[PDB]
Design a binder for this molecule. Structure first.
Ligand SMILES: OC[C@H]1O[C@@H](O[C@H]2[C@H](O)[C@@H](O)[C@H](O[C@H]3[C@H](O)[C@@H](O)[C@H](O)O[C@@H]3CO)O[C@@H]2CO)[C@H](O)[C@@H](O)[C@@H]1O
Length: 393
């Protein structure tokens, strides 16, 4: 009889994991609903406007790591201190810190983290003459993104008709960038995306792959890209664990069991989110309890076991739910073992308030231009112009 609504983006996985049903069994007086804006690009500016005005908010709001520093910095007075509801000792300290203010309030509780790996179609790799065993696949490119592109060139030589090695240029760039500790900001808060040699180098390698026909001409997280998943149009993609939510959500039933997961060239992090509670909502108390419960170790373990998003709560890593986890898309692959290995040297990244919009510009206003037939130099100039306009106004 008390309705609690979550405002989400993407595929958080709470509903699919049965977590709302579990909670409603514990608390029969609670009715959980959600509203979803598919792309964070569309979700976040609306969230910010809703927080500013106090109008249009849900009882709980999700926040991506690309935006969390802006939410903590400018909207913390509008958010409940969840340090009294969730336990600091449950979370990775660096994760806890991302959602916390200098005043000692924790206004966002961590969901997942994004240790980098590569998800691939065993059948398409086998058809092209590549290994399909995950250890052998990982050995193709251990320690080197150049060896990853070389493996793509080999795939292209024998590729099944109408398939590309990878789904998108954006996904490849995000993967290459994921191994950097300082991507777009340094520890002093300086925006470094234009001067960090690793960013330009990742962009140019992505452009090389694009020019060589290794990647689909697709922006990620759009209906046409969903169709490329459905119709088996690519052999591999960058796979932080939450990408499994997308693969499972957009695949045809026939693809169940046909994917597997290899270690990436380098350890990396792409993504991670949080739940926050607007403090002035009529249900803030119940919302805070629900938010803390959804992000507690047991519930993070359950979500991993069903949807594949990897916990930010280390006690979960020793649970059977994680250790023995499988995913429908990956058959009998031990995804707990695989992602534990991918997470062992996960970089603790310097974040900043405009990470999200920088990422967006480098991908959707950057490397996509190369698959559209622009030079790498034109693509970079376009990205810089686009990002700088966002940062400067
Ligand atoms: O699905 C749940 C997981 O979401 C992860 O965030 C991703 C968003 O779901 C997705 O909408 C967004 O897509 C971006 C894309 O990365 C960017 O290159 C393009 O220009 O714009 C798209 C639309 O915003 O990507 C993010 C990842 O950066 C969370 O990281 C994860 O915690 C969560 O479980």
């Amino acid at each position: 009889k008390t309705k609690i609504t979550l405002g989400l983006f993407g595929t958080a996985g709470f509903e699919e994991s049965g977590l709302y049903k579990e909670y409603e069994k514990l608390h029969p007086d609670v009715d959980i609903q959600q509203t979803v804006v598919e792309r964070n690009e569309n979700y976040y500016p609306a969230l910010l406007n809703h927080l500013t005005t106090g109008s249009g908010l849900q009882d709980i709001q999700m926040v991506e790591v690309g935006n969390i520093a802006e939410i903590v910095g400018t909207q913390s007075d509008k958010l409940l201190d969840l340090s009294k509801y969730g336990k600091e000792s449950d979370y990775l300290p660096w994760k806890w810190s991302q959602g916390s203010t200098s005043g000692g309030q924790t206004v966002a509780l961590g969901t997942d983290v994004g240790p980098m790996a590569i998800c691939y179609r065993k059948d398409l790799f086998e058809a092209a003459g590549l290994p399909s065993d995950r250890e052998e696949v990982g050995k193709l490119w251990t320690g080197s993104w150049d060896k990853f592109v070389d493996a793509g060139n080999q795939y292209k030589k024998k590729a099944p008709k109408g398939t590309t090695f990878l789904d998108s240029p954006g996904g490849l760039l995000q993967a290459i960038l994921s191994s950097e500790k300082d991507r777009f900001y340094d520890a002093s808060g300086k925006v470094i995306y234009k001067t960090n040699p690793a960013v330009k180098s990742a962009f140019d390698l992505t452009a090389k792959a694009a020019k060589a026909g290794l990647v689909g001409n697709q922006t990620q997280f759009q209906p046409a890209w969903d169709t490329t998943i459905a119709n088996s149009k690519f052999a591999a993609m960058s796979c932080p664990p939450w990408m499994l939510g997308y693969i499972k959500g957009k695949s045809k039933p026939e693809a169940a069991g046909k994917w597997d997961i290899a270690q990436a060239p380098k350890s990396g992090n792409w993504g991670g989110s949080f739940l926050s509670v607007p403090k002035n909502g009529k249900n803030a108390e119940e919302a805070a309890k629900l938010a803390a419960w959804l992000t507690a170790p047991e519930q993070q373990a359950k979500l991993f076991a069903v949807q594949g998003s990897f916990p930010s709560t280390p006690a979960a890593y020793d649970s059977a739910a994680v250790k023995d986890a499988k995913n429908d898309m990956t058959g009998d692959a031990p995804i707990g073992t695989i992602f534990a290995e991918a997470a062992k040297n996960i970089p603790v990244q310097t974040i900043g308030p405009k990470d999200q919009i920088i990422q967006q510009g480098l991908t959707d206003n950057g490397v996509i231009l190369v698959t559209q037939g622009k030079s790498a130099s034109d693509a970079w100039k376009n990205a810089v112009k686009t990002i700088d306009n966002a940062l400067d106004k």
